[PDB]
Amino acid sequence: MSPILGYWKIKGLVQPTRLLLEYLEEKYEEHLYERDEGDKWRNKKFELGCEFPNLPYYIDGDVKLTQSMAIIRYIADKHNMLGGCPKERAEISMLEGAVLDIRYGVSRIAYSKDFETLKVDFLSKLPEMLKMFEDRLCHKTYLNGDHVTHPDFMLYDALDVVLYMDPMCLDAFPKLVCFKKRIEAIPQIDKYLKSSKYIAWPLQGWQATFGGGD
C-alpha cells in the first residue's frame, strides 16, 4: 500500500534518501522515532522482519532493507538510476564514496568529547575534498553530467552540514555554491524544503556535540 522509511526524526544518515524520494515523487510514509522514543524503537527493532535490524530501515512489501546506502541505491535502482554499464555504475559509486568521506568525516567526530579540536583537523582537509567536486562541476551540471543521480542529494546533504560547521567553507568554491542552490531550485526539492515534512534539525543524534540538541 505504501513503502515505509524508518529512522530517528533527524537528518542524519537518511536525509539524502528523503530528498531522492521527493525528487522522484515516490509515495512513502515515515516511522520517525523522536528523541524520547528509544524504547519504542527497541520494541520494533526485531519485529519488522529485518535480517540486519538497524535504523534507517525501508519496508517496501518487496524488501525489508536496513543499511542507509543500500536503501538509497535501491530506490534509485527502482528508477533505473544506478548506471548502465559497470563503468557508469562505478563512476556513481565513486561519487558516493567521495561524498561520504565528507559526511562521515563529520559524523565520525560528532558526539566525541574532542569534537572542538577534531573539527579543526577535519576543516583543514575539507578544502582538498571540496576541490575535487568543484573541479568535477567545472564541465558537468550535476555530479554525473546533465542528469541528477542520487550522489547529488548526498553532496547536497554534505554541503548543508559542513556549512553549519563553517559558514565560510564554500567561499572560494563558486561552483559548489551554485550547485547547492541548483538542487534547492529543483521544483520537487524546493517544495519539500518549504514543507511540513522537512526536518531542519538536528543534523546528528540529539546527543551529539555537533549538530545535536533540539
Ligand X SMILES: N[C@@H](CCC(=O)N[C@@H](CS)C(=O)NCC(=O)O)C(=O)O
Select from a second copy, ligand X, none the partner in contact with residue 48, using the beta carbon and a kind-dependent cut-off of 5 to 8 Å: none
**Nearer residue to ligand X within complex by CB, 137 or 203:** 203
**And the C-alpha cell for 81?**
538510476
Q: Is 54 annotated as a binding residue?
A: yes
Return the exposure string of 125-153: e unless at least 16 CB atoms fall within 10 Å of the residue's CB, then b: ebeebbeebbebbeeeebbbeeebbbbbb
Which of the residues 70 through 109 are near ligand X (CB under 6 A)? 97, 101
The strand pair at 4-8 and 29-33 is best described as: parallel
Q: Is 7 annotated as a binding residue?
A: yes
Residue 32 CA to residue 74 CA, distance in Å, equals 20
Which one of 52-60, 112-120, 183-191, 193-201 is the stretch in contact with ligand X (CB under 6 A)?
52-60
List 4, 24, 32, 63, residue binding a second copy (CB under 8 A): 63
Residue 95 burial (10 A CB sphere; 0-12, 13-18, 19+): buried
Which one of 61-69, 78-86, 138-146, 157-165 is the stretch in contact with ligand X (CB under 6 A)?
61-69
The strand pair at 64-65 and 29-33 is best described as: unpaired
List 17, 66, 144, 149, residue binding a second copy (CB under 8 A): 66
Q: Say whether residue 53 binds a second copy (CB under 8 A).
A: yes
Q: Is 45 annotated as a binding residue?
A: yes
Reported as type and span, the H/E element at residue 72 is helix 68-78
Using CB under 6 A, list all residues that contact ligand X.
Answer: 12-13, 45, 54-56, 67-69, 97, 101
Q: Which residues are annotated as a binding site?
A: 7-8, 41-45, 54-55, 67-68, 111
